[PDB]
Design a protein around this ligand. Structure first.
Ligand code: HEC
Length: 108
């Protein structure tokens, strides 16, 4: 519901030191461990260019937004339970705030 911020600087590296392991910034990346985002902030859940999300996640589709994504970060699968989970726990708002700060800057 409410969006919090802090510093994109660290948030930019947070993605590189965490999401990079599974997600790739390049659009249509190899999708090794999981599908690659980059630009999905303005798309519905389940829409990808290289690898489509899991049929379960694809069954459920929701428009993405900085506010909507904030809730998803709390749980790799909140409104989209069909989506798989595997993140340590970005429950800390400090990481989630700076994280999206960089993603929003790019989508900006
Ligand atoms: C591998 C162990 C992962 C790491 C580490 C991160 N994510 Fe992930 N993420 C992973 C999977 C398995 C999936 C979906 C599987 C499928 O194919 O459906 C996801 C999905 C997301 C999404 C959902 C958005 C959407 O496309 O609908 C987001 C926004 C997301 N992941 C963000 C994200 C960030 C911020 C990470 C770094 C902090 C991160 N993921 C790491 C697997 C893995």
């Amino acid at each position: 519901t409410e969006f919090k911020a802090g510093s994109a600087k660290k948030g930019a590296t947070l993605f590189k030191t965490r999401c990079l392991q599974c997600h790739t910034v390049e659009k249509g990346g190899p999708h090794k461990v999981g599908p690659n985002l980059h630009g999905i902030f303005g798309r519905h859940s389940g829409q990808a260019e290289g690898y489509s999300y899991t049929d379960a996640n694809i069954k459920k589709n929701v428009l993405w937004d900085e506010n909507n994504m904030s809730e998803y970060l709390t749980n790799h699968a909140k409104y989209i339970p069909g989506t798989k989970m595997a993140f340590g726990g970005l429950k800390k708002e400090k990481d989630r705030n700076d994280l999206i700060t960089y993603l929003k800057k790019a989508t900006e």
